């Protein structure tokens, strides 16, 4: 639903870089560039940008009040 | 008091087909919610640790729990009388890791030999002389298994992969092949460890072990055999992937040749029934003749293609190694997935013609040709035709209907088998009779 | 609902030793050192450090039950050098070698840093 | 006297199952019949059903 | 390919050719013998038998 | 007409113009009987032996057989039937996100997952069914290997770590309905704190952990046997109120109060629960590889690559001959290869274009064995392994199955009315059946004693 | 034009067309 | 003094409402309403 | 929620991937499985050999 | 629009490399 | 009869990992260190989160489960603060932890974005990694919700839980030529070339070397962000020696006893 | 009664007291779903009011 | 009757859980949890002994 904090097989923080990654990917990058610009070498930690689903979106279209 | 440490219980899986369903099991108690038991165990049960259930009795008397100890207990039910062979028998990983054991081409150092002989219920406490002393101290695995074996036991088995023409011709006692296995005072001498010597069948060392030594003597030879070999399995490893699963780019030439043959031979076939020159074979009609050439040209085709893609196969590959441990697999089912997967039969025949006289829309009308009846000619690694895959998901539907109705109409069988004959026994003047104390035999089993 | 915690580990319970020694009787200059609350970390380099002394007849590790926070050392040397000296030895040689390993890395890094 | 199961409650476990339950069939034949004819997947089966979803207990 | 003891095999054989007669496992075959109504009710037909 | 399609969207261009245009056709299965159907169009017609050149018709694509369980399996022809329609019914017990508005719905056993990753290879069909959308799984890096011994027979080696860091971590719901109503003219219902003074039926648990409303309120600790709605009905008055069911030990989400179609007052309450995965629950891939995690190492001790990447899931290598799912193999290798890259791949079962060598090659151009094989270490002694082990990338599922809702226990617990005998059912505190086959065992094995004290002593003694 | 080659993903966009145009659940 | 207090459905409006009177919002007028949260002492453990 | 844009379905406290098609009753998701019997109006002609007709003309 | 335009790009240039296919793991059936 | 003198070599010192090699040294004492470096870390985390009003879309848990895996910046704190479990007092001191706050509500119209930048600490150098790159993503509020809480960190190790791991991910590799033949490679000539590899490339691998131990250990310790590599080393033998001096306390003390 | 463990290796845990003796007290937990059995003296009431009321 | 509650019972001090492969135990032991444990009994009778 949300990004995770850290890589479950690694263990680095790749919650602090999904912003930078839609950024990346939005302005001209294509996913096999953006990965290793924001420093993912291993192939572990580069699922949590691709397989990861992004519903929070969705969770927040039912604001609660006004 | 709670259930404590060492206490008697009846661990019982939920269907009881046999004697082998529910013995007697000492406790001991872990952190996790979740019942364990030794794999070897898990054949009388039939369980599979993919989500099942076994249930688990506990007695409220000493008269009791006496008695389970010393009728129902794992050790003492060991070997079975419907057909007088061991029942728990390393039909698991274990099986694989200590066949490649037991090869003549298996060295180990001082310290992976003082770790193995850590898991040793029954080490007499001294170091073994290594099989090669210089340039460096190296010990071998048949050796170190002769220390898992307990007692004197002496016993002859054949390898899987033995050939019949060895025993006939020279190199009878000694075999190149590290075959005809032969223990002499519990010491593994020759041969190659496989579920003829270690697996559920009549004469197997387990067998032999338990005939000449105790109950408890089997049951500390298991745990030994267990805890060493998969220990050493660390140190060794198994896997399997596509590596294991690719040829050598010449068995598919040959692979791809014999299918053109024996489909040039089926066309050529059916040109003959077109003609009428096809005579019909004594006792069966045109039809069935024609089916019955097909099938077996078909079957050939199979079997040429198995043979030549097993031929080709390496020592290092990882199916070739499980099938011949048998552990888990078998010849045929290398040939499915590289040679070629085969006939997809249903009802003992061909695929019939759904529509008018033709099985799918896509192939013509009088299509009698194998890709057109359900032969499958690609494998499970190049992929599959949709129709080939169509017919091979009716097959697959065929055998579950099968087991489904099997499932259904063994039990009520069961059932009145055991209403039939549930009060017969062997009285103490030495023979069998019923509740009206009718002789059926002076003397049981005659 | 029956997990055990995670201090479980590495922190002993009241009543529970942290190293116990059982003297063996199949063979003579022989014990078996019982761990409590550890794992292979602090048991191979121990069997490695043992098997580099030659006096040393026979030593290796294991773990009874991997649930189980607990590992058993058994240990034989020579008659004339009883296995206590020599797990002692063992442990004091490879905490110098620690040391002297941890003095070298800093300077090595000390010495990296503009150098 | 009349039949059973012609309306079930909708699984809502997962998506997969709620759109496999919205499209799903049931023969009126008696459960667990001993003949095995109904029950294998017939050749005029392509395209209309898929092959291989199905139960694999009685039904 | 499997094997199963020929003792077991005799004594099935015997019990169902013991009363001369070829007595059926069923229960047209095993109510018939002189056992006793508790023991025919358990199997089958039981308040016919009762 | 593809021109004018694929610029549908933006202008107004649908199906229904294609079905118009006379290019597409509704045939039904009994007149697909008399139509020479094609596969494909370009290989199917170009110039060969003549087989028939009469196709009257087309079929869109293959794969298009498929149901909608059977659609989300990558490569299914790869496999054997029986292990395509077991996952095919696995599929459906697959735990997730079921709905986007679950916060409001108050379904009874609803499971949510918290991290649903997307398939690392998703098949051109599913790209409708929804499923990238709301996915069922989590992609774990998978090798393939018998590590310790505790994944032999079909079960599989979580990692601690993983978990730890919410690994397959998922939560579960229960929600619960109860209302008053008017029983009779004396008899009335009515929602009240059950003192200890005035009430004479009562339970044996904690009143005050409630409101004075009587309903529970949200975010409160709760533990089997407890009680969640204050209801008491008068005769003084009788605690006919309702308690959590016996090993759940939730916390509540939140209240619900309103009126039924009667008038009266109806509430709500469900109480959730963070289910963390441990050993016994049941997992299973999208090939039929079900399994339950036997144990749990942390990091240190699972091995590990040339790099630090140790693996999430170790299933059994004996698994793969005998099932024949070469189809598993082939994702995970693709998966690999999608993740080096770093872009979803495909997974089409029929697509001419996908084989096992053309994927290996990719594979080679990235510093990794051509197969997939990698060289991993001993997580305890760290020495090398000799056999290559199989590690990469798969995506896994989990099933609700868990270990806490089936385990049970009994100890001479309540008893039925009719006959004297225990009750059934885990949520009924009852106990096992003891089935004739057990005693027609216990018969065989001899040992009358335990057969009676089984029938007699613990089922129902009575004079 | 006929399209030769070029097909797997023309093959696809009339799929998309049909299950935008008619939902899963349609006949019901 | 707690005249325990709600929230309602779709104004998410706090409203108070006592023992045996109607379930309904102060204003519009609406069936649904759900409960604020406990005044307790939730506390989690990070784990 | 006939042909209604997923902004109102959001407000409403639903989401548009709903498949819909599903009665309630009692808030519960029921759903009509769809029975499948034989085609009428179509002459079928049976050969039941268990009987004393060779064939049958069922209609 | 960027994986579009990356499926028809890859089309054409599969379409143009069109020298030789000679792989071992494919086939397709060929009746009469 | 005694200890070898091993040697160090740093081939790469940079502020999120370090490259070292460790030569004459046995494999054993290289992957204790290896699993102390991964599991036995002293290092501080979240461990207790007190929410007093969440009313974001998530659950209650998920937010003390995401906080607990937000790194904490401890090169001078860990080595001075105690184990809550040892300490003398009660509540959490700040002498044995270290106290944090977090009260966002979203009021504009535009969503927020709850960061890690909006946990306020009490202590200037225990903060999360945002001193010198975006920050970790808690939760994301809308109008009309809010998230206030304050929660506390304490030292703990890696073997307890995963938060407390430091180490992203540690390259542990020997003998790159596959000499001492560890692993046998069915086709050689299939497998790429090691990093470490001084192989040509003509040559598949090294030929067999009976008389051979294992040396030149190469590492390639990956900080998340919270301890330094070279820190996380200096630490992770600290903590191994003081592991051995107490087992060598404890064995005098038994055979003294006995 | 809400009460929080001061000593000992659950040091910090929230739970109410479920069962209590005169030497033990079986007190669950608030975040892990199990129940444990500290000593009593390990706890320390911190209650749960709402001062004002007006 | 017969078939429902004299040949077939429902017995008392039973259990029914998951299992799990465990090589590390004989095969005459098998790992029971906590809590099955904790909640069944076994009558002993009391001796000096
Ligand atoms: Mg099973
Ligand atoms: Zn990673
Ligand atoms: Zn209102
Ligand atoms: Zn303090």
């Known amino acids: 639903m949300i990004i995770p904090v850290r890589c479950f097989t690694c263990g680095k923080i790749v919650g602090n870089k999904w912003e930078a990654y839609l950024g990346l990917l939005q302005a001209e990058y294509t996913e096999g560039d953006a990965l290793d610009a924001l420093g993912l070498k291993r192939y572990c930690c580069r699922r949590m940008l691709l397989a990861h689903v992004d519903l929070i979106e969705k969770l927040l279209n039912y604001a609660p009040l006004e | 008091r709670h259930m404590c440490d060492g206490d008697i219980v009846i661990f019982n899986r939920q269907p009881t087909l046999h004697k082998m369903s529910m013995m007697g099991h000492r406790v001991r108690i872990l952190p996790w919610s979740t019942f364990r038991l030794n794999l070897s165990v898990t054949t009388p049960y039939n369980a599979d640790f993919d989500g099942d259930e076994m249930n688990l009795h506990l007695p409220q008397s000493l008269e009791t729990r006496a008695e389970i100890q010393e009728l129902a207990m794992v050790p ?74 307990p007692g004197h036991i002496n016993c002859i088995r054949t390898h899987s992969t033995h050939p019949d023409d060895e025993d006939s011709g020279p190199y009878k006692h000694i075999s190149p092949g590290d075959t005809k296995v032969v223990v002499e005072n519990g010491e593994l001498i020759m041969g190659i460890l496989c579920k003829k010597s270690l697996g559920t069948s009549a004469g197997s060392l387990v067998h032999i ?129 590289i040679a070629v997967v085969g006939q997809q039969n249903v009802e003992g025949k061909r695929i019939p013609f759904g ?34 895959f169509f017919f091979h998901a009716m097959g697959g539907r065929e055998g579950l209907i099968d087991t489904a109705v099997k499932t259904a109409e063994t039990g009520y069988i069961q059932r009145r088998l055991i209403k039939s004959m549930e009060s017969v026994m062997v009285k103490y003047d030495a023979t069998v009779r019923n509740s009206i104390n009718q002789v059926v035999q002076l003397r049981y089993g005659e | 609902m029956n997990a055990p915690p995670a201090f479980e580990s590495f ?99 000390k010495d990296k840093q503009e150098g | 006297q009349a039949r059973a199961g012609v309306s079930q409650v909708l699984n809502r476990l997962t998506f997969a199952s709620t759109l496999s339950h919205l499209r799903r069939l049931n023969s009126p034949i008696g459960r667990d019949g001993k003949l095995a004819k109904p029950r294998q997947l017939h050749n005029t089966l392509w395209g209309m059903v898929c092959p291989a979803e199905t139960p694999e207990g009685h039904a | 390919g499997s094997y199963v003891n020929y ?44 | 007409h593809i021109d004018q399609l694929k610029e549908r969207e933006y202008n107004n261009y649908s199906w229904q113009d294609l079905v118009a245009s006379g290019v597409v056709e509704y045939i039904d299965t009994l007149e697909e009987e008399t139509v020479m159907l094609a596969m494909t169009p370009d290989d199917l017609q170009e110039k060969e032996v003549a087989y028939c050149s009469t196709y009257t018709h087309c079929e869109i694509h293959p794969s298009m057989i498929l149901g909608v369980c059977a659609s989300i399996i990558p490569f299914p022809d790869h496999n054997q039937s029986p292990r395509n329609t077991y996952q095919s019914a696995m599929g459906k017990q697959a735990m997730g996100v079921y709905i986007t508005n679950f916060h409001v719905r108050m379904d009874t056993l609803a499971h949510v997952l918290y991290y649903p990753q997307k398939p690392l290879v998703t098949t051109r069909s599913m790209e409708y069914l929804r499923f990238r959308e709301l996915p069922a799984g989590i992609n774990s890096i998978v090798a393939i290997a018998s590590y310790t011994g505790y994944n032999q027979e079909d079960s599989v080696i979580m990692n601690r770590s993983a978990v730890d860091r919410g690994f397959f971590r998922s939560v579960f719901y229960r929600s619960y309905k109860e209302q008053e109503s008017k029983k009779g003219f004396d008899q009335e219902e009515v929602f ?48 006919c109120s309702t308690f959590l069911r016996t090993s759940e030990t939730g916390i509540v989400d939140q209240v619900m109060v309103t009126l039924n179609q009667e008038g009266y007052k109806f509430c709500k309450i469900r109480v959730r629960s963070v289910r963390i995965p441990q050993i016994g629950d049941k997992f299973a891939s999208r090939h039929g590889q079900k399994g339950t995690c036997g144990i749990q190492y942390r990091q240190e001790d699972m091995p590990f690559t040339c790099e630090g990447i140790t693996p999430d899931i170790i299933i059994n290598p004996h698994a793969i001959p005998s099932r024949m799912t070469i189809g598993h193999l082939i994702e995970c290798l693709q998966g690999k290869v999608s993740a080096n890259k770093g872009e979803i791949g495909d997974a089409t079962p029929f697509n001419d274009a996908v084989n096992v060598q053309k994927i290996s090659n990719l594979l080679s151009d990235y510093g990794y064995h051509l197969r997939g094989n990698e060289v991993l270490y001993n997580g305890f002694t760290g020495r090398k392994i000799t056999s290559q082990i199989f590690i990469g990338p798969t995506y896994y599922q989990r099933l609700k199955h868990m270990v806490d809702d089936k385990i049970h226990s009994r100890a001479r617990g309540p008893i039925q009315i009719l006959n004297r005998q225990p009750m059934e059912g885990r949520s009924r505190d009852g106990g096992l059946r003891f089935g004739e086959m057990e005693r027609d065992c216990q018969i065989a094995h001899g040992a009358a004693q335990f057969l009676r004290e089984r029938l007699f002593e613990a089922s129902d003694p009575y004079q | 034009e006929i399209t030769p080659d070029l097909w797997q993903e023309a093959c696809w966009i009339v799929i998309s067309s049909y299950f935008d145009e008619k939902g899963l659940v349609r006949q019901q | 003094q707690q005249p325990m207090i709600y929230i309602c459905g779709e104004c998410h409006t706090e409203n108070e409402i006592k023992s045996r009177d109607p379930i309904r919002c102060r204003e519009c ?11 307790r002492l939730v506390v989690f453990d990070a784990r | 929620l006939n042909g209604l844009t997923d902004r109102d379905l959001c407000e409403l406290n639903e989401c548009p991937l709903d498949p819909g098609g599903y009665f309630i009753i009692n808030g519960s998701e029921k759903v009509l499985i769809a029975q499948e019997k034989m085609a009428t109006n179509t002459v079928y002609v049976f050969a039941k050999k268990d009987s004393k007709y060779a064939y049958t003309g069922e209609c | 629009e960027w994986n579009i335009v990356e499926s028809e790009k890859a089309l054409v240039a599969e379409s143009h490399n069109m020298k030789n296919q000679q792989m071992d793991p494919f086939t397709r059936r060929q009746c009469k | 009869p005694y200890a070898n003198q091993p040697t160090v070599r740093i ?13 004459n040294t046995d494999l054993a004492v290289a992957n204790s260190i290896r699993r102390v470096f991964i599991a036995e870390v002293p290092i501080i985390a979240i461990d207790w989160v007190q929410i007093d009003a969440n009313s974001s879309v998530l659950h209650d848990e998920f937010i003390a489960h995401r906080l607990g895996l937000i790194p904490l910046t401890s090169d001078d704190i860990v080595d001075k603060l105690q184990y809550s479990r040892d300490c003398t007092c009660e509540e959490f001191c700040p002498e044995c932890s270290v106290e944090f706050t977090l009260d966002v509500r979203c009021n504009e119209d535009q969503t927020r974005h709850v960061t890690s930048r909006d946990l306020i600490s009490n202590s200037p150098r225990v903060i999360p990694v945002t001193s010198r790159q975006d920050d970790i993503l808690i939760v994301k509020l809308r109008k009309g919700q809010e998230l206030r809480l304050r929660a506390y960190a304490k030292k703990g190790f890696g073997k307890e839980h995963a938060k407390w791991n430091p180490t992203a991910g540690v390259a542990f590799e020997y003998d790159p030529d596959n000499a001492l033949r560890h692993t046998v490679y069915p086709k050689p000539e299939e497998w790429p070339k090691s990093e470490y590899s001084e192989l040509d490339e003509d040559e598949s691998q090294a030929p067999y070397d009976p008389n051979g131990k294992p040396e030149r250990f190469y590492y390639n310790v990956e900080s998340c962000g919270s301890l330094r590599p070279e820190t996380i080393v200096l630490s992770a033998l600290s903590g191994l020696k003081k592991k051995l001096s107490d087992l060598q306390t404890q064995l005098s003390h038994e055979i003294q006893s006995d | 009664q809400t009460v929080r463990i001061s000593q000992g290796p659950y040091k910090g845990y929230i739970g109410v007291v479920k069962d209590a003796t005169e030497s033990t007290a079986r007190v669950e937990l608030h975040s892990t779903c199990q129940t444990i059995s500290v000593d009593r003296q390990r706890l320390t009431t911190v209650g749960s009011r709402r001062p004002g009321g007006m | 009757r017969v078939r429902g509650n004299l040949m077939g019972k429902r017995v008392d001090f039973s259990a029914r859980t998951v299992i799990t492969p465990d090589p590390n135990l004989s095969i005459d032991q098998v790992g029971v949890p906590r809590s099955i444990a904790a909640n069944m009994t076994f009558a002993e009778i009391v001796t000096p002994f």
């Open chain 3, 11 to 109: 922190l002993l319970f009241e009543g529970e030793k942290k190293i116990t020694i059982n003297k063996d009787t199949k063979v003579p200059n022989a014990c078996l050192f019982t761990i409590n609350k550890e794992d292979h970390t602090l048991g191979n380099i121990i069997k490695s450090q043992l098997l580099k002394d030659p006096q040393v007849l026979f030593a290796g590790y294991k773990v009874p039950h991997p649930l189980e926070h607990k590992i058993i050392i058994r240990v034989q040397t020579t008659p004339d050098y009883s296995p206590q000296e020599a797990f002692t030895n063992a442990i004091t040689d490879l905490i110098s070698e620690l040391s002297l390993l941890e003095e070298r890395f800093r300077v090595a890094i």
């Open chain 5, 7 to 50: 003792r077991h095999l005799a004594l099935l054989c015997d019990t169902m050719t013991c009363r001369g007669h070829l007595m059926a496992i069923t229960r047209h075959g095993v109510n018939r013998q002189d056992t006793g109504p508790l023991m025919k009710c358990s199997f089958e037909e039981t308040v016919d038998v009762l």
């Open chain 6, 192 to 239: 009240e704190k059950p003192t200890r003074e005035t009430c004479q039926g009562m339970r044996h648990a904690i009143y005050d952990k409630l409101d004075d409303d009587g309903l529970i309120a949200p975010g409160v600790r709760v533990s089997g046997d407890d009680v969640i709605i204050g209801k008491t009905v008068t005769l003084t008055k009788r605690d």
């Open chain 2, 76 to 149: 003492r039910m060991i070997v079975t009388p419907q057909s007088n062979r061991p029942v728990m028998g390393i039909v698991q990983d274990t099986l694989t890791a200590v066949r490649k054991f037991t090869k003549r081409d298996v060295f180990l150092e001082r310290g992976e030999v003082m770790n193995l002989l850590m898991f040793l219920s029954t080490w007499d406490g001294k170091v073994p002389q290594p099989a090669i002393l210089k340039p460096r101290p190296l010990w071998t695995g048949k050796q170190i298994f002769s220390l898992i074996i």
């Open chain 2, 209 to 337: 072990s338990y005939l000449e030594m105790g109950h408890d003597i089997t049951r500390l030879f298991y745990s030994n055999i267990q805890t060493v070999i998969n220990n050493w399995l660390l140190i060794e490893g198994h896997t399997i992937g596509i590596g294991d699963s690719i040829a050598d780019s010449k068995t598919y030439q040959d692979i791809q040749n014999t299918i053109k043959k024996a489909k040039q031979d089926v066309i050529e076939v059916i040109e003959k029934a077109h003609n009428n020159e096809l005579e019909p074979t004594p006792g069966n009609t045109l039809r069935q003749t024609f089916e019955n050439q097909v099938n077996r040209i078909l079957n050939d085709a199979r079997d040429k293609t198995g043979s030549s893609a097993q031929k080709s196969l390496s020592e290092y590959n990882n199916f070739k190694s499980m099938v011949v441990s048998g552990a888990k697999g078998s010849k045929i089912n290398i040939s499915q997935v």
């Open chain 8, 29 to 39: 007028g609406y069936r649904i309403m759900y409960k604020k949260r406990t005044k």
């Open chain 11, 11 to 23: 081939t790469e010192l940079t502020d999120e990992n370090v490259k070292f090699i460790i030569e």
């Open chain 2, 355 to 388: 529509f008018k006289h033709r099985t799918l829309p896509h192939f013509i009308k009088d299509d009698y040709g194998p890709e057109s009846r359900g032969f499958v000619e690609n494998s499970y690694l190049a992929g599959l035709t949709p129709t080939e």
